[PDB]
Design a protein around this ligand. Sequence first.
Ligand SMILES: CCCCCCCCCCCCCCCCCC(=O)OC[C@H](COP(=O)(O)OCCN)OC(=O)CCCCCCCCCCCCCCCCC
Ligand SMILES: CCCCCCCCCCCCCCCCCC(=O)OC[C@H](COP(=O)(O)OCCN)OC(=O)CCCCCCCCCCCCCCCCC
Ligand SMILES: CCCCCCCCCCCC(=O)OC[C@H](COP(=O)(O)OCC[N+](C)(C)C)OC(=O)CCCCCCCCCCC
Ligand SMILES: CCCCCCCCCCCC(=O)OC[C@H](COP(=O)(O)OCC[N+](C)(C)C)OC(=O)CCCCCCCCCCC
Lengths: 205, 61, 506, 90, 491, 158
Amino acid sequence: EQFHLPQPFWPTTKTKEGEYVPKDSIREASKVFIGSGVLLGGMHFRRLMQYKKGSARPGLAKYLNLFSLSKSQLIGFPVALGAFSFLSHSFANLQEGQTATGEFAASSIASLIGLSIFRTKKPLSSNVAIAVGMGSLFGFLTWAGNFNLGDNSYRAALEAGNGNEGGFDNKVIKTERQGFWEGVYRRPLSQTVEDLGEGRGIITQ
Amino acid sequence: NIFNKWNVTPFVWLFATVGIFQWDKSHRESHDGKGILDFLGEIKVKESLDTYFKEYQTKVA
Amino acid sequence: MLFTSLLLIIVYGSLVNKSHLLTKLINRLGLIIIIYTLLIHLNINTLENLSIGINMFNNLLLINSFNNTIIELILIICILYVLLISFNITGLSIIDNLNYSKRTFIVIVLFNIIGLTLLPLVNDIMILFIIIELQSYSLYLLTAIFNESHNSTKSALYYFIVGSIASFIILDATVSIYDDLGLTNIQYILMYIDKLEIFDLLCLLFGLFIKIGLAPFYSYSITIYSLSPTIITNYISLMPKLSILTLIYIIMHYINIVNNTDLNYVISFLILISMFIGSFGGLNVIRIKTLLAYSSLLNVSYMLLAILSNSNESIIAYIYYIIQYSLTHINIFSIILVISIYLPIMNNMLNVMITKYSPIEYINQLKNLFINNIFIAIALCISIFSLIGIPPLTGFYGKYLVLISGLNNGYVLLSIVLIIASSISTVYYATILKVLSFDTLSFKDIISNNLIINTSPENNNNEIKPEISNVISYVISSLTLIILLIIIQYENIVKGAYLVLLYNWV
Amino acid sequence: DHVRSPNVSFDDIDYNNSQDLHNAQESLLREQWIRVSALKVCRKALESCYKTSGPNHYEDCREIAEKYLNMLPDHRIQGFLGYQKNDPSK
Amino acid sequence: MLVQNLIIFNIIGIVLLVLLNNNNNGILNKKSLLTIKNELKLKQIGLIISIINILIIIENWIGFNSNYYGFQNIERFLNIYWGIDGISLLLVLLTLILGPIAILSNWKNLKGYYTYYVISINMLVILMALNFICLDLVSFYILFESTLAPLFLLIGIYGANNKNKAAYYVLIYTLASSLFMLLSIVIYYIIINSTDYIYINNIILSINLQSLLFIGIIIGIAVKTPLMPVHTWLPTVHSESPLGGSILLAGVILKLAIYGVIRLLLPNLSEISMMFTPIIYIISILTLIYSSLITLKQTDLKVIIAYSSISHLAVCMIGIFANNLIGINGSLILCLAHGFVSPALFILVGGILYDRYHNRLINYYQGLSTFMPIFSIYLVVFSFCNTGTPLSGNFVGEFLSITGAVIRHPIIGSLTAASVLLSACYQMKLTNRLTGSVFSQYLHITNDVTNREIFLLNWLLIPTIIIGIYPSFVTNILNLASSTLIYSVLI
Amino acid sequence: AFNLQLEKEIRSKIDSLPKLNNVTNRKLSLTDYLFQNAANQALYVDNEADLKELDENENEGWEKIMYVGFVPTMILIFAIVLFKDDKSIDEWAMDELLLRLKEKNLSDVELIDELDKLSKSHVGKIGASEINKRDAVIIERILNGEYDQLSGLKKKEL
Ligand SMILES: CCCCCCCCCCCCCCCCCC(=O)OC[C@H](COP(=O)(O)OCCN)OC(=O)CCCCCCCCCCCCCCCCC
Ligand SMILES: CCCCCCCCCCCCCCCCCC(=O)OC[C@H](COP(=O)(O)OCCN)OC(=O)CCCCCCCCCCCCCCCCC
Ligand SMILES: CCCCCCCCCCCC(=O)OC[C@H](COP(=O)(O)OCC[N+](C)(C)C)OC(=O)CCCCCCCCCCC
Ligand SMILES: CCCCCCCCCCCC(=O)OC[C@H](COP(=O)(O)OCC[N+](C)(C)C)OC(=O)CCCCCCCCCCC
C-alpha cells in the first residue's frame, strides 16, 4: 500500500504499451553536434574576416567582441548541445516518454560537461551550482508542458466535449474517473478511498 | 486617596455589569424570556434570509 | 476629413509668417481636425453594422468591429497627445517653446494618423506594403523633426535603417506568398491558407515584430526612446504599437485556421525571451525613459500572449489591455513633462548635462515630488501601481484578462513566466516610488528657493497663480481617476468588449 | 419561536437547485448536532451514576458506560461535504 | 447596508481630510489652524472615523442570526456580492477595533505628515475588513493585494533606518507569491466560468487539478501567515515599519492567511486538503519549532516579537487544517487572541521603550522594574498571555488547536504540544532579562507609562481575558459556520 | 471664541521679550478653523509656537474621543455578547432533542409532567446541578431512544 501523495502534474497524451517507437539517440545527437559545430565554427571564421575588413573603427570592434567566442567555447558549446541531445533522447527511451526528471538530468549533466570545458578557471562547485540551475529550468520547462499544452489544454478539451459546457448533474455518477478539466457534482465513494485511503475519517473514524 | 480615579473605575464596571445583569434577569420574566436589548432590533429569520440567498444564487448562475 | 484638412494646413503653414504663436494656433487647428475626424467616424461607423466586415475600395481595405475599435482609440489618444503641443505643459517659455518651434510638427502627426488608422484595415499584400511604409516614413520624419539636435538626428538615422530592414522582410514575405499563389488579395489568399507555406506569414510577423521592439530586436527601441526628446518619445513609443499589434492579431487570426503548432512555438520562444529582457533589463538603469522602454517591451509581451492565443477571451483581453495601457502611457509622460519645473538649479561632481529636449532624464530627478506636489506625486504613484498590476487598478484587470486567455489556450509556461517577470519588474517600478516619497519626512523641513518654478515672475502678489496650466493638469486628473476608479464601471466596459467581434458571429 | 430542521436528503434533490442543496446541507448539519446533544445527555447520566454509586460504579453504570464508548466515535460533527460529494453505493 | 455604508462613509472621510489639509498648499507660506499642535484637529477627525467604522458593523451584528446556516446580510455593490457568516463577523470586528488603537499608537511619535498617515491607516483597516465579506475569489484577491500600495508607502515614509529594505521585502514577497494564487483563481474562472464561493464549493475537480490549484493557493497563503521557509520578510518589516503598521500587520494581515484557508481551500478543494494535511503539519511543526529556537538568538527587541508571531500562527495553521471542530474553533480563537496580545507586545517594545530611548538592541535594557513599575506589570502579564498561560484567550486557542491536532493526527500532531515549552523559553528569557538585575547603566531615568499608553495596553488586555475566561462569546457564533468546513464520510 | 484682542495682548508680551528659552482662558471654536481669514489666523499660530517654547503628557486631544466614542462602543459589544437573544446551534439542538422527546412519547404521562415544569432557562441544564428539578425520566427516555434522523437523510449505503 503506497502512500497517498498529491500529483500536481499537467495532463499529457499517453501512448499505450507497445507504442512509443524509440528514437535513435546517436543519429539525433550527431546532427546537433555537427550542425552546431559548423555554424559556430563558420561564424567564427566570418567574424575574423570582419576584423580584417577594418580594425581602426571602434564601433565595429565593440560589437564583434561581444559575439566573439573563445576557443574553449567553440569546442564546449557543440559538445554540451550534443550531449544534451543524446541524454534527452536516451533518457526518454528508458521511460517510454519525456519527463521533467529526465530533462533535468539531461540538462544538468550536459551543462556540467560543457561547463567543464569553457569554464575551467572556476571552482568545480561553482559549475555544479550553475548546472543544477540550468537543469532545473529545463525540468520546469517540461513540467509546464513545453511552450504549449496542445491538445491537453482546456480549449482542446472544451471542443472535444471533455469540458464543463453542459453543466453538472448529481443524479449521474460515473464509475470512471472524470477528465482533467471536468468537474462533477458528486463522485463515487470508491474513488475517494483510492485517492485518500481509509483512515482519518474516510469510512472509518 | 483610596477612592481615586484609578481605584473606583474597576468597581464601577462590576456594579454596572451586575445591575444590568439583574435588570436583564428581571426583564426576561415579564417578557417571556426576551432580553433587555430587544429595543435595538430582532434577529432575522431563515425564511427571509433564504430569499436573498435564492436570488443571489440565481444571478450567479 | 484628415486628408482634405491636411492639405489646407500644409499650404496655410507655408504662407503665414514664421512665429511661435502662429505655430501654436495651427497646432490647435490640428486638434480641431482630429476632433472633427472622430465625430465623422463615429457618425457613420457603428459596432453592430461592422460586425460582418465590409470591403472597401475594390476589396483593398476591410473594416470590421475589431478594426473599428482600434481606429477610434487611435483618434482619441492622438487628441490627448496634440493637447501637449496645443497648450502649455509647464507655462515657461524656456521649456515650452520647443514644441512651438517646428511648424511641420502637426503636419507630420496628421500624416502618421492616416497611416496608423489604415494599417489594421489592409486587405491586400500590395496595400499592406504601401501603408506600412507610409506609417514608417512618417515616424522617421517625426523622430528627425528637431534637426538641430544631434541625438534626434542620430536616432532617426538608427530608426530609418532598422525599419527599412523590417520593411524589406515584410516585402520579402509578401512577394514569397505571391510567388506561391499568384494572388494579392488577402481574402483570396485565405482560400489557399492550407496550401501556402505558413512560415512565410511568420516571416511577415518577424518584420512586424521588429517595428514594435520585440526581442531579440529590442535593442534599437530602447536606444531610440532614450535619446529622443520626451515629447517625441511619448508618441513614437506608443502609436506604432496601436496599429501593428492590431494587424498582428488579424494575421494570427488567419494563421490559426491551419493551427500550425510549430508557428506557435517560435512566437512563444520570442515572447519568453522578451519577458526575460523586459524584466531583468530595467533593473540596472538610471534613465527614466530607458526604464519606460523596458516597461514598454514587457507590456507588449503580455499583449502578445493574448494575441498568440487568439480566442474569444483574447479579443476581450487585447482590447481592454491596449486601451488602459495607452491611457497609463499618456498619464505617465504627461506627468514627466510637467514635473520638470521642480528641478533644482545649480548655483560640480559627475558633470551631469541636461538639455532642453529632455529636462527629465534620470530617475533621481523625481526626488522630493511628494513634497513639491503631493497631488501630482500620487497621480504618478497610481499610474506606477497600475503598471505593477495592483488591484483594483486598470493594470490588474489587463493582466487578469491576459492570464485568462493564456491559461485557457494552454500556455502554462508563458503564464507562469509572465508572473515571475511581473514580480521582477516590480523592483524597478518600486524604485520610482521610492525616489518620490521615501525621503519626505527628512526633507519636509527644507528650503528650495532654487527650483525652476521659482524663476517665474508673479503677477500682483495677490492673484492666486496656479503652478500648472488648466489643460494639462485636467488631463492628468481625469486619467488618474479613470485608472483608480475603474472598478465602478468595469463590468459594463467588459460587456462592450464582449460585443467586439472578429468574424465570430455564432 | 423554535424553528425546526427542514428534513431534506442529498439523494432526493438536484444539486442544480441551489435552494434544495442548501436545505440538504443544513438538514445534515442539524441532525449531527442532535447526536452531540444526545451524547452530552448520556454522559450526564454516566457522571450522575458514577457519583452516587461510589465503589459500585462498575456494576451500576456498566450499560451506560458501554453506550457512551460506542456512541463517542461517531456522535460528533462530521460536516456535509463528505456525503454531498460522495456516493456510498458506488 | 454594510459594505455600501462602510465604503461611502470612509471615502467621504478621506475626501474631508484631503480638502481641509491641502487647501492652503498653494505656496501660501501660511500657518493655518488645522496644523496647530502637530495637526491635532486632523488626527482627531481620523480617529473619529475609525470609531464610526466599528459602529457600522455593530448595527449589522444586531441582526446576525447564529442559528442560520449560510451567508447573511447578502448585498450587491460594485457588481460584487457581499455576505457575512459566523467566521467573517468576528474577524471584521477585530480589524475595525485595531483601527483606533493603531492611530492612537502613533499619536505624537511621528516626524510629520499625520494626515497622510491617518488616511493610510483607515484605508488599510477598511480594505482588510472588506476582504472578510467578499463572496468570490476575484474580489478576495482584489482586496488581498490592494493593501500593498498603502502599506508600501507607509513603511517607506514613516519607517526606521532600514525602511527602504523593509518596503521592498513586503511589496515583493507578498506580490510574487499572491500571483501564484491568482493563477489558481484564473483557472477557476476558466473551467467553471465563476469564482463565487457557493458555486465553486459544490464542484469536484480532478485529483491532479486539485493538487495544482492547492499548490498555487497555498504559496500565497504560506507566505502571508507566514510559514517557513518563506518567512524571512516578516522580521525585517516589523523591525522597520511604524508602530501602527506593525499593529495592523501583526493583528490583521497575518490572519488573512488563516481566513484564506477557510474560503479558498477547505470547502472547494476538500479532497486534496485531506491529502495535503500531513505535509502542512510537517511544515507548520518545523515552523513552530525552528522559529522558537531562532528567537533565542535574536538581539533586536522588535525582531523577537516578530518571530513570536510566526510560532503562534504555526499553531493556527495546524489547528485550522485539522478536520474536526475542536481544531477549527481553536485556530479561530487563537487568531482573535493573537490579534490583541501581539500588538501589545509591539506597543511595549516599539512604542514605549523605543519612543524614549530610540534603540532596539537588547543589551541596553535590564532591571526596568526599578523605575518603570507600571511598564513591567503589563510586560509580565502580556508575556504570560503570549506563552499560553490559562485565563488568557491564547491558552484557549492553543489548547484546542493542540487537541484538534492530536485528534487529526495522534502521532505527529502531538508535537504541537512543544509550543507550551518553546514559547515560554524565548518569551520569558526576554521578560526575565528586562525586569531582572539592577537598572541598566546605559539608560537615564525618565517617565513611566503615560495615560495614552495605559489606555492602549488595558483595552488590548481586556478582550484577551474575556475570551480566555468565557470563550463561549466566540464559540457560539462560530459553531454553525465552522461545522461546514469538515469533510468526512463515516459509514 | 477667537478673541482677536487676546492675541494682541499676548503677542505684545512675547514681543516685549527679545529673548526666548533664556492664556489659560483661551480656546477655539469649530468655526475658527474654517471661517477665520488669513490676518487673524496667522496671529494665533505665531503665539502658539512661542508660548509652547516658554515651557506632563496630558490633554493630548484623544481623551474625550476615546472615552465617549470608543469605550461606550466596547460596552455595547460587551452588552451584545451578554444580553442578545442568540440561539447557537448546540443550544438549538438541545431544545430540538427535548421537543422530539415529546413528539415521540406523547402517551407517556410521566414524561409530559417533567417537560412542562422544566423551564426554558433550565432546559439546557439537564443533569446534576444546583437547581432542584425532576428530569430523571427525561434522561431515561433519551438513554433508550435514538431521536436523531441522520440515517433518514442517508438513503444510500455501501
Ligand atoms: C550564436 C549566435 C548568437 C546567439 C543568439 C543571440 C541572439 C538571440 C538571443 C536573444 C537575446 C538577444 C541578446 C542580444 C544578442 C546577444 C549577442 C551576444 O552574444 O553578446 C554576448 C553577450 C555579452 O557577453 P560578455 O561575456 O559580457 O562579452 C564577451 C566578451 N568576451 O552576452 C549576453 O548577455 C547575451 C545574452 C542576453 C540574454 C538573453 C537571455 C534570453 C532568456 C534566456 C533564459 C530564458 C528565460 C526563461 C527561462 C525558463 C524557460 C523555461
Ligand atoms: C524560499 C523562498 C525562495 C524565493 C526565491 C526562489 C528563487 C531562488 C533563486 C536561486 C538562484 C539565485 C540565487 C543564487 C544566485 C547567485 C548569483 C551569484 O552568486 O553570482 C552570479 C553568477 C556569477 O557568479 P559571480 O558573479 O562570479 O559571483 C561570485 C560567486 N562566487 O551568475 C550566474 O552564473 C547565474 C547563471 C547565469 C544566469 C542564468 C539566467 C538564466 C535564467 C535564470 C532564471 C530566471 C527565470 C526568470 C523567469 C522570468 C523571466 C523569463
Ligand atoms: C478607498 C478608496 C481610496 C482611493 C483614493 C484615496 C485618496 C487618493 C489621494 C488623493 C488626495 C491626495 O493626494 O492628497 C494627499 C493626502 C493628504 O496628505 P497631507 O499630509 O495633507 O499631504 C501633504 C500636504 N501638506 C504637507 C501641506 C500637509 O494624502 C494622501 O495621499 C493619502 C491618500 C493616499 C494613500 C495611498 C496612496 C497610494 C494609493 C494607491 C491605490 C492603489
Ligand atoms: C514563491 C514565493 C515567492 C516569495 C518571494 C520571492 C523572493 C523575494 C525577494 C525579495 C527581493 C527584494 O526585496 O528586492 C529588493 C532587493 C534588495 O536587496 P536588499 O535587501 O537591499 O539587499 C541586497 C542589496 N545589497 C547587496 C546592496 C545589500 O533587490 C533584489 O533582490 C532584486 C531582485 C529581486 C527579484 C525578485 C523576483 C522574484 C521572482 C518570483 C519568485 C521566483
